[PDB]
RNA sequence: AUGGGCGCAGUGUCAUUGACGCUGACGGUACAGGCGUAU
């Protein structure tokens, strides 16, 4: 639960590139590992900021009042 | 006794001799001699409801012998309509048979059927046969060496004729 | 491919494949066949278009092919078909050569001819609309023509 | 983020058990990684 585990835990589950290889085998594993070193880094990153994150305003930005302002909109005209 | 006159087109000897003579004896004819004019075989069933009779004209599929041609179709009871899934051509002949059989025969049971679909070599595709759709035509893919489907045209004939629809046949 | 025996074969054989072919080709009971019939006809006549069968096959005339296939042609159909009209084997000879780029419309030519082998014609051309025909057969050969030039 | 031509897996078109890709819950558990680079 505490930070430094679940840190600890992400970084020892990525194995590094394996250096064996030829040299442009070896960079493009290292390039594709950075690139999800940088993926990863950002989840540590937004699990550190907190656990929730968001509030859940941005449903009612998106569907609740794009809802009501048609909910008011509705007309009878008869029938 | 309890006998349809029932009218067999396609073309001659590719399946409709080779059907007939498989129902008759249970023999897949391999050699393929061209069905001279019309051939007229009794051929028996026995269902869940007793004997039933088919007066099969399997007619002759080669302009140079149809003989008679429409003429055979006169009274005909029902109809079954031939053509063979590897080769299209056999297939878009199967309007030209269906016209001249309701011009003869305006309100009779069809049965289009696709023989030997054994031969893996099938052209006419499945998804294409659909000409039965707007006709209204019963479909079958059969074939008369391994017997796939060998008897569902007879009995949807035997249960359209007698108008059982759950009608079944038996072995004797 | 093989051009040394290509002449020799072409002087052999030529004549009698086309009269086993036509033969074939007039029989009702070959009908599904046409395409391949369409298939090699086309492809023999263009042979003998552009001249790649280079001897004559008349020992007694030394002429370019084409002029003696279609002599030839029109006698063995006359010959077989002697209730047909001159013209319209003159006609469907020229499609035939006209007609050798397209294959479907090249089928068709075969399958009209074929309709027209079934019936004793008089001299009563009106119902042939030999003109139509000869007209739509000058526009075929004409964009063959184009076709073969813009090569 | 990018997808090359073939490992063939379903096949759409025609001359349809041949050819172009798409596509296949594929031959692929493969391969490609700007033109040193710290974007």
């Given at each position: 639960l505490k930070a430094v585990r679940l840190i600890k835990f992400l970084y020892q589950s990525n194995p590094p590139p394996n250096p064996e290889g030829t040299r442009q085998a070896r960079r493009n594993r290292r390039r594709r590992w950075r690139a999800r070193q940088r993926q990863i880094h950002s989840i540590s990153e937004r699990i550190r900021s907190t656990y929730l994150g968001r509030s859940a305003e941005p449903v009612p930005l998106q569907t609740v009042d794009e809802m009501t302002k048609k909910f008011g909109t509705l007309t009878i005209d008869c029938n | 006794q309890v006998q349809f006159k029932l009218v067999l087109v396609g073309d001659?000897?590719?399946?409709?001799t080779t059907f007939v003579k498989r129902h008759l004896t249970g023999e897949f004819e391999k050699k393929y001699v061209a069905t001279l004019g019309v051939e007229v075989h009794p051929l028996v069933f026995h269902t869940n409801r007793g004997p039933i009779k088919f007066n099969v004209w399997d007619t002759a599929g080669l302009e140079k012998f149809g003989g008679l041609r429409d003429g055979y179709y006169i009274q005909a009871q029902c109809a079954i309509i031939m053509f063979d899934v590897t080769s299209r051509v056999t297939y878009k002949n199967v309007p030209n048979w269906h016209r001249d059989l309701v011009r003869v025969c305006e309100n009779i049971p069809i049965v289009l059927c696709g023989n030997k679909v054994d031969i893996k070599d099938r052209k006419v595709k499945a998804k294409s046969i659909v000409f039965h759709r707007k006709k209204n035509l019963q479909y079958y893919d059969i074939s008369a060496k391994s017997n796939y489907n060998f008897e569902k045209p007879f009995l949807w004939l035997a249960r359209k004729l007698?108008?059982?629809?759950?009608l079944e046949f038996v072995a004797m | 491919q093989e051009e040394a025996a290509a002449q020799s074969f072409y002087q052999t054989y030529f004549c009698d494949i086309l009269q086993h072919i036509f033969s074939v080709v007039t029989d009702?009971?070959?009908?599904?066949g046409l395409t391949m019939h369409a298939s090699i006809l086309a492809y023999m006549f263009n042979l003998v278009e552009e001249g790649k069968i280079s001897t004559s096959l008349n020992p007694g005339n030394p002429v370019n092919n084409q002029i003696f296939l279609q002599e030839y042609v029109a006698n063995l159909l006359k010959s077989a078909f002697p209730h047909l009209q001159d013209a319209q084997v003159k006609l469907f000879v020229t499609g035939l050569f006209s007609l050798n780029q397209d294959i479907p419309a090249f089928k068709e030519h075969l399958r009209d001819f074929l309709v027209q082998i079934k019936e004793f014609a008089?001299?009563?051309?009106?119902?042939?609309?030999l003109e139509e025909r000869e007209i739509a057969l000058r526009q075929a050969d004409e964009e063959k023509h184009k076709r073969q030039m813009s090569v």
């Open positions: - | 001659g000897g590719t399946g409709k007698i108008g059982d629809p759950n | 009702t009971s070959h009908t599904a008089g001299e009563d051309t009106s119902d042939l609309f």
